[PDB]
Structure formats: structure tokens, C-alpha cells
Amino acid sequence: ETAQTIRYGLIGAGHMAREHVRNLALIPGSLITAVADPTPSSLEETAREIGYDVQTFSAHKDLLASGLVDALVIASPNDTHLEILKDIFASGTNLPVLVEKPVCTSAEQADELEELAATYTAPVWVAMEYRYMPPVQEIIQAAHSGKLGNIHMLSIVEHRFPFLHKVDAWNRFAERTGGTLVEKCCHFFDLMRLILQDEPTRIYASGGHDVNHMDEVYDGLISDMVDNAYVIVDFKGGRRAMLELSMFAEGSKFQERISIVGDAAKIETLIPVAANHWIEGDETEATVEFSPRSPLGPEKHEVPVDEAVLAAGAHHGSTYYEHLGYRKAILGEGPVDVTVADGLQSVRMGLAAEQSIIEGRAVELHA
Amino acid sequence: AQTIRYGLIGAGHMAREHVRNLALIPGSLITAVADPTPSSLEETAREIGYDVQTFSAHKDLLASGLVDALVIASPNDTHLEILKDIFASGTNLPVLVEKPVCTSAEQADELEELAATYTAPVWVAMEYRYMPPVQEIIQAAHSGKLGNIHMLSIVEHRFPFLHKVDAWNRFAERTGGTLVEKCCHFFDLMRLILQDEPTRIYASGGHDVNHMDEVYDGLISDMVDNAYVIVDFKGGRRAMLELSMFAEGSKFQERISIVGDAAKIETLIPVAANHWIEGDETEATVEFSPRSPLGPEKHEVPVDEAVLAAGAHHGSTYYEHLGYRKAILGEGPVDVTVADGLQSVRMGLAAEQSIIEGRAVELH
Ligand SMILES: NC(=O)c1ccc[n+]([C@@H]2O[C@H](COP(=O)([O-])OP(=O)(O)OC[C@H]3O[C@@H](n4cnc5c(N)ncnc54)[C@H](O)[C@@H]3O)[C@@H](O)[C@H]2O)c1
Numbered sequence A: 001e002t003a004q005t006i007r008y009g010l011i012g013a014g015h016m017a018r019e020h021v022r023n024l025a026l027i028p029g030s031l032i033t034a035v036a037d038p039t040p041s042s043l044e045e046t047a048r049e050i051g052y053d054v055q056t057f058s059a060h061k062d063l064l065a066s067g068l069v070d071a072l073v074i075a076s077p078n079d080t081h082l083e084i085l086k087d088i089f090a091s092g093t094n095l096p097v098l099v100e101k102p103v104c105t106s107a108e109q110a111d112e113l114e115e116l117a118a119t120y121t122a123p124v125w126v127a128m129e130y131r132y133m134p135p136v137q138e139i140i141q142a143a144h145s146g147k148l149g150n151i152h153m154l155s156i157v158e159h160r161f162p163f164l165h166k167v168d169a170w171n172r173f174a175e176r177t178g179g180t181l182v183e184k185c186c187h188f189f190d191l192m193r194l195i196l197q198d199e200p201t202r203i204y205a206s207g208g209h210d211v212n213h214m215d216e217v218y219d220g221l222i223s224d225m226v227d228n229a230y231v232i233v234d235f236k237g238g239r240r241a242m243l244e245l246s247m248f249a250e251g252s253k254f255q256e257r258i259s260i261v262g263d264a265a266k267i268e269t270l271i272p273v274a275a276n277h278w279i280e281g282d283e284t285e286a287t288v289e290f291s292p293r294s295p296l297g298p299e300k301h302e303v304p305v306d307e308a309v310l311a312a313g314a315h316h317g318s319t320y321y322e323h324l325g326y327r328k329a330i331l332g333e334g335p336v337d338v339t340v341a342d343g344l345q346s347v348r349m350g351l352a353a354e355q356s357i358i359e360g361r362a363v364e365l366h367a
Numbered sequence B: 001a002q003t004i005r006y007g008l009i010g011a012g013h014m015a016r017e018h019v020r021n022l023a024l025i026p027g028s029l030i031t032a033v034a035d036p037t038p039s040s041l042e043e044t045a046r047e048i049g050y051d052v053q054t055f056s057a058h059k060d061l062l063a064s065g066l067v068d069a070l071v072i073a074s075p076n077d078t079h080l081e082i083l084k085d086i087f088a089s090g091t092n093l094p095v096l097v098e099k100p101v102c103t104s105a106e107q108a109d110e111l112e113e114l115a116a117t118y119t120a121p122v123w124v125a126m127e128y129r130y131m132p133p134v135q136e137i138i139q140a141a142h143s144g145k146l147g148n149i150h151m152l153s154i155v156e157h158r159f160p161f162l163h164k165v166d167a168w169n170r171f172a173e174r175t176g177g178t179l180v181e182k183c184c185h186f187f188d189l190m191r192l193i194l195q196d197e198p199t200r201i202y203a204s205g206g207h208d209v210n211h212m213d214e215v216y217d218g219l220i221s222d223m224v225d226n227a228y229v230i231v232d233f234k235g236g237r238r239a240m241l242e243l244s245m246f247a248e249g250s251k252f253q254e255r256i257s258i259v260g261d262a263a264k265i266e267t268l269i270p271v272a273a274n275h276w277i278e279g280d281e282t283e284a285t286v287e288f289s290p291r292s293p294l295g296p297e298k299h300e301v302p303v304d305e306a307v308l309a310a311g312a313h314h315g316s317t318y319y320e321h322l323g324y325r326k327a328i329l330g331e332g333p334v335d336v337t338v339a340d341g342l343q344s345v346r347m348g349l350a351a352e353q354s355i356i357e358g359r360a361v362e363l364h
């Protein structure tokens, strides 16, 4: 049981970086060595969380020259993801990267990243982790095993609280985030491609900035970000999906609903609000419900998460499994489950959707 | 109880639901029943349980002098002819005309002009609003208990289209399309709950599972069996409809969620006892979820055993009739007007048009 050891470098050391550290703390062989972030308060809090001594830098290139690291984790703001990847690619360090979603934030960016990512050879994983939520694992297995028959429809409903406060308010601005439908919803456009095993062809969306962040001023600016939307997505093989997002529906005991409908059965999972954002002492569990057409007879069970794994994140235990998988890719004992290609599609879908909200019209996509 | 003499024009599946419901309302007497299919007159006569005059054509029924009020429950594309005829009859009879009130744009234009000059009660039989659980949702929305409303979602997961006389419901040309035939109730609910008028609509649907390649009397089966619809409104609200006609395993057939800036509310309507398993009668729920303070409240909403048993629309048909009665007597208004019917149809038609051309459609 000699744990092989991986030395992790964190580039960006804020809210999500600290979720990575709590999760790596549950995985033997996991050691944080370097942490780069140009905001001192961020380095301080992240160092407190790690709980043991680490080298800190205020710039990533220094971290890259340190020789302190076996693998990278990028958790900086969305629009910075490309620069840091270009830099990692040109470093000659050939380091594995776990880069947070969205992998980028514009069409120009995605084009560039597509060409560049081809020549880089080390594991590059886009940190879209929703698929590893245990409840959502079942849903996906069921869909893939043909237990639903031919799949026709996928609905995703997220009802949640306004965008949280982040360092320098980066998440309040379309140009830094890619828009709400890239920032928040890329996870969901990915899930669509994964579950339906198909590529989108058309997308229409209707959304607004109707409720949130109205009294928050940032050097004379208000948030330009969407806080509610419906999205319909058409696919190559005649399947269709729908996304409902509200960022002011936080009263809802269940934050996510995902239903898949095939021609033999339907399946539906309900994901609760994380314990951190919900009332104290009212922890509900996630459910999965299987509903065959014939014979009638729905079966529903709770899908529990290990008390520790659940407590380490606000994404229902997913971050832990993401890291077990990143580890295996780093060691060569497993694949990159969520590629750059995956990331680029999810972003392009979200960008199309942001475009549809602006022009009041559907938008075509290319394979 | 004053007595109302009802004429049924069309005497199939839905006509028999009206009869079971009128049977629960004192003062209610069926006198005439018109339908061009003998077997239909026979079954409907068995259901009524007492003697009635039958005709094979509606104008005969209209001249009979047997009736105080009409109920049209014929196939969708016949609704206009019968209404034109009722209007020109000089009988000045109250009409309860089944949804959809018509099936094309030409039809709706015509009916709009004609219905203006007719003076007797004309009520469109979109009854979903009277389902007790749906009553709450609407009161909550109207009382401001949700705050300013931004989103309304409606999910129907159900069984394929049933078998009907002469297969009329298998053809877009006879029905107006699935989004008119099945979904007009829902586009109406949108206007009622949001208290607003739609401005744009986009939809994506297909004929992917059910009733592929059925020919019957010149037409080919062509009806949509799954669809998503987004509707934009004048006041910056938006609604979404999800329909699957092959999701009948779902213990809950309808889900309706409203999201405002102070709270969310959501009702779940179970499959009617007729279409569900024998052992497992479940009840409808309503769940209120305020943003601040957190604390969702959920209760079941029961229906009177009798009222529920008389229909497959969760007690709504009964209340529709209590209200039609009051309009007939002059002791009450027309809750669901022609205008209401025309909007719901135009919404559904726009949506059918959107599915065809891959593009959103404006509304007036
Ligand atoms: N996968 C998920 O479930 C999930 C959840 C939340 C956030 N995220 C992603 O994590 C990333 C950061 O989100 P967050 O909530 O931690 O935000 P945060 O603002 O709390 O943390 C961002 C940090 O990055 C630092 N930073 C800024 N510019 C930088 C640069 N040029 N180089 C390096 N670091 C820089 C900031 O100083 C800040 O400390 C984003 O990509 C976001 O989309 C993912």
C-alpha cells in the first residue's frame, strides 16, 4: 500500500480551489506543493484550508519553473483559462492539467484552443464534474444500457440562489464569464451530449436579467448577466433537450431535476441543495425514479453519498470522483473522461444560446 | 332546481364524460343527442340511462325544440360548421363547445367575426383551471404570494393518443395538430396564470414513436408525439411546455411550477384512476417554496370521490358544468370565452408552425 504521490499545483486559489483541496485531502497520494494567485488574501485563505506548508507565488509562470509539481489544477476566472493553458503548453513542462469549466469564453478563444490543444500530449481534463454525482451516475448508466429504449427527450431544471460573491466580482460580467449560459450551463450542455450520445444542430433560448444584482455597483457598472432562461436544443438524430434555469428559486428543496424519456421508460433524479446553502438539520437525500411504460410500476430509491465526500464540496460528492479519475489519468491507469473537445462543444452550445437570447431567434450549429 | 334540457352534438368518449357529470347536477336533463355514427348513439344512450330523442344530424336536433342548451363534443374540425349553424339558427341557444374551439387560422378569423354578433352564452370547454390543485396555484399567483412572476413550466407525461371514431385524432388536418388538440388547455393556463398576452413562441417537436403510417379515409397519420415549447409574454415573463405521449409510466402526469421573485409553487397531478394501476390511487400535491426564509410547505389537495370518478380530468368537468349552468340561467358569467379559445388555438397553431420551419413566430 505504498501510495504513489502526486504533487499538485493550484493556479487560482479561491472558492473552487479550496473545494479541490478539501477533496484531495480525502485521496491518499495527494500533496499540494505550489499555489499561484495574484491576490494575497486568496493565497492566505487557501493556505489556511490546505493546513500544511506550501510554496506560494503571485504568478503562474514562477510556479511552472519551480519544479515543485507533477500536475496542475486551474481554478482562475473563466476568461483567463486560455492564457494559462497557452503558457503551460509552451512551458516544456508537459504537465497534466485539470482546467475548470468553462474551458474558454469566446469563439475566437475556442478556435485558438482547438488548434493548440491538438499538439499538447499530456492529460488535459475539463472539470465538468456533474456526471460523477452518484445519482447522476445511475441516470447515465440507465440511459447508456438501453434500459430506457431509444431516448428522445432530456429535461434539466436548475432552481438556485443568485451568483455568489467572488474575487473582484469577475462572475458579474458577460465578457469575463462567457455569459450565464456558458458560466453556469456548460455542465448541462455537456450532460446533454453525454446522455443523448449525440451532437446539437440548433438551439433557441429566451432569457433575461430580470431580478438579481440590481443594487450592486462595481465602479459604475451593474451585472449584465442573465438570471433566468429556457433553452431548447435540437440534435442530429432527432432527440431534443430542454434546460430551465432560475437564479432566484433557492427556496426549492431540490436544486436540480433531470428527467430522461425513452420509448420504453423514463428516469428522473432529484438533487438537493448542498448542506452549506440549506437550513441546518434538514439534510435531504437525492432520489432516482425509474418509470417503465409497460408494465406500469415506478421504482424510487434514495442514492446516498459518503458523509465525508458530501461535506467536502457543494456539488454532491462529484469533486471527489473527478479527482479519483484525474489521479488515474496522471498515473496512466485510466482515460481523460472529459476532454478539451467536450469543453469546446459545451461552450459553443452556451455561446449559441447567449446569441439566441440577444437576437430573439434560433441559432444553427456545426458538427 | 330549475331544469335545463341539454342537447349533445357528438356522442363519443367526451360526450359520455359530460353525461356522467351532468348526472351529478340536479336540474340536468339530456333530451336530444345528435351523431352520424349509430354505434355512438347506442353507447351514449346506454350511458345516459333514460330515454332520449336521437338524431343523425345536428340541424335536426336544432329544430327539435327539445333543448335549452347545447354541448358540442364532435371532432375538432367540425366545431366551426356547427357553430355557424347554431348562430344562423335563430334558436339563440347557449353552447358549451369542446376544445379546441377551431383548427385553423382561417377558421379562427371567421369565428371571431361571427361570434361577436351572437348574444347567447358561448363557453369554450377548457376545464383544467377548475382542477382543485390547479385552483390553488392560480390563486397563489394572483394574490402576489409569489411576487412578480417570471417563469411558468408545464410538463405533461402521458400515454399515446387513444382510439377514436373514424381515427379523426390521428390527422393534423382534422385536429389542428397535437399542439392545438392536446396543448390548448396549457396555452390557456399560461394566459390565465401570467395574466398577460404572449408575444413570441418557438417549439421543437417530432412524430418519433406513435402512430407511424396509419391511413384512414384519405389522410396519413402525422401527429407530433413529443415537443418542447417556449413562449414569451408582453411583460417579460416566459413559459415552457414539455409534452411526451410515451411517458405513461410516470406516476405524475402533469407538473406545473411557477417561479416568482419571492417564491416558487409547484403542483403534481396524478394519472386518472382509469389509466393507472388498480392498487395505487395517489393524490395531487401542492408545494410552496419561499426564497426567504427557506422552508417549503407541502400538502395534498383532495377531490370529492364522486366528482373525481365522473371524469379523467381530476374533477374539473363538474365545475365546468356548475359554471355553464349559472351562465345558462343568467346567474353568472362565461369564465372561458371564445376569445380565450381563439388565443389558445392561435398559440398552438403558431407552435405547430414553429416546429415546421425551425423558427420562432410572433403573436399579436
Ligand atoms: N466545476 C464547478 O463546479 C465550479 C464551481 C465554481 C467555480 N468553478 C470555476 O472555478 C474557477 C474559479 O471560480 P471561483 O468560484 O473559485 O472564483 P473566486 O473568484 O473565488 O476564485 C478565483 C481566483 O482566481 C484568482 N485569479 C484571478 N486572476 C488570476 C490569474 N490571472 N491567474 C491566476 N489566478 C487568478 C483570483 O484572484 C481569485 O482568487 C472558474 O473557472 C469557475 O467557473 C467551477
Ligand SMILES: NC(=O)c1ccc[n+]([C@@H]2O[C@H](COP(=O)([O-])OP(=O)(O)OC[C@H]3O[C@@H](n4cnc5c(N)ncnc54)[C@H](O)[C@@H]3O)[C@@H](O)[C@H]2O)c1
Pocket: B009, B010, B011, B012, B013, B014, B015, B034, B035, B036, B037, B040, B058, B073, B074, B075, B076, B078, B098, B099, B100, B125, B126, B127, B164, B165, B166, B168, B181, B313
Ligand atoms: N376537454 C377535454 O379535456 C377533452 C378530452 C377529450 C376530448 N375532448 C374533445 O372532445 C371532442 C371529441 O373527442 P372524443 O374523444 O369525444 O371523440 P370520439 O371519437 O370518441 O367522439 C366524437 C364523436 O363525434 C361524432 N361525429 C363525427 N362527425 C360529427 C359531426 N359532423 N357532428 C356531430 N358529431 C360528429 C363521431 O361519430 C363520434 O361519435 C374533441 O373536440 C376533443 O378535443 C376534450
